[PDB]
Design a protein around this ligand. Structure first.
Ligand SMILES: [Ca+2]
Ligand SMILES: [Ca+2]
Ligand SMILES: [Ca+2]
Ligand SMILES: [Ca+2]
Lengths: 191, 191
């Protein structure tokens, strides 16, 4: 057993800490979570690693399927689209991220009506997501992968705030939020 | 031979198009570059893919070493740090990116003195990079990998503008800029 520590924000609100948490939980790895009042930071023995998608990728490389459970798609094109989704969510949609921060997700916080920039960003999210999920599949690529969780978090910034969201995306994001690993993270801030 | 197209901005200034270009060139893949007046976009036969790090990752998965040349480190911890670097550069340092856009790199454009936010961001870059390159190695992990190119681009936003940059980082970024693949991209906009 390697010693594993995941560093979180004190509120357990970071969506990137959520992402790293889910990667760890879905691998079934034993770890301690610690808070800082720079996150997430993974420590495994004498190795340290930051950036939540790099952390998931490392866990998948090091604790490789089929011995440990898989968190990236096996098919290379599905795998590429998973990475595309992770990268896009971290590089785009800044208005949603700024106008709907994750206290809306984890603490029921209410914020202001969307700006013009916020609405345009929300419509871009909806168009992309509807395309990604055009088969109406519960998980992006059939079986769940880490990108489902990240995408659902982004959609839930709107869904859980009460903003109007196409029904199929509500259904997707709500189903993803029932994921056990996600529910276990939510519990950290519920009390 | 699959049909490969890479879509670039019309000026060949995108640092993300540069990154995807370098991944393609360093794999030794045959491709056409096309411009749009959403980039980079990779097309390979009937598959499409966006986000420059996802594109490199796909190329490494699909055109796998040792048959094709390697663009990510073999060691899993070095590989993780490469991904950490790629992810960090795309998610942080926004002031450098905004105050030193890549026309400074590819067209010798001159911009304004750094803001207070810009200087703080530059010092963060310098501290991280000096740490990453503390052995004074020409490439981050010994052998070159795609993260060297991305990191050098970020440093060169400052170096090529004339901003003051620690000598070891100047030396690093200048050496990386001599990479044949990078020189081939530069040629696109030189004329
Ligand atoms: Ca499984
Ligand atoms: Ca396939
Ligand atoms: Ca080589
Ligand atoms: Ca190692």
């Amino acid at each position: 057993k390697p010693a594993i520590t995941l560093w979180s924000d004190a509120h357990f609100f970071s969506p990137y800490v959520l992402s790293a948490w889910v990667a760890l939980q879905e691998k079934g790895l034993s770890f301690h979570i610690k808070t800082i009042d720079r996150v997430p930071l993974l420590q495994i023995d004498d190795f340290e690693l930051s950036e939540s998608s790099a952390i998931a990728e490392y866990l998948e490389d090091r604790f490789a399927p089929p011995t440990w459970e898989r968190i990236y798609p096996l098919d290379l094109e599905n795998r590429a689209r998973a990475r595309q989704i992770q990268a896009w969510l971290r590089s785009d949609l800044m208005p949603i991220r700024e106008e709907r921060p994750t206290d809306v997700v984890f603490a029921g916080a209410k914020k202001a009506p969307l700006t013009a920039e916020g609405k345009a960003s929300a419509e871009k999210l909806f168009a992309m997501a509807e395309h990604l999920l055009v088969l109406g599949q519960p998980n992006l690529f059939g079986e769940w992968c880490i990108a489902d969780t990240d995408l659902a978090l982004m959609i839930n910034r709107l869904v859980l705030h009460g903003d109007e969201v196409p029904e199929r995306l509500v259904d997707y994001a709500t189903f993803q939020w029932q994921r056990a690993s996600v529910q276990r993270f939510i519990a950290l801030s519920a009390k």
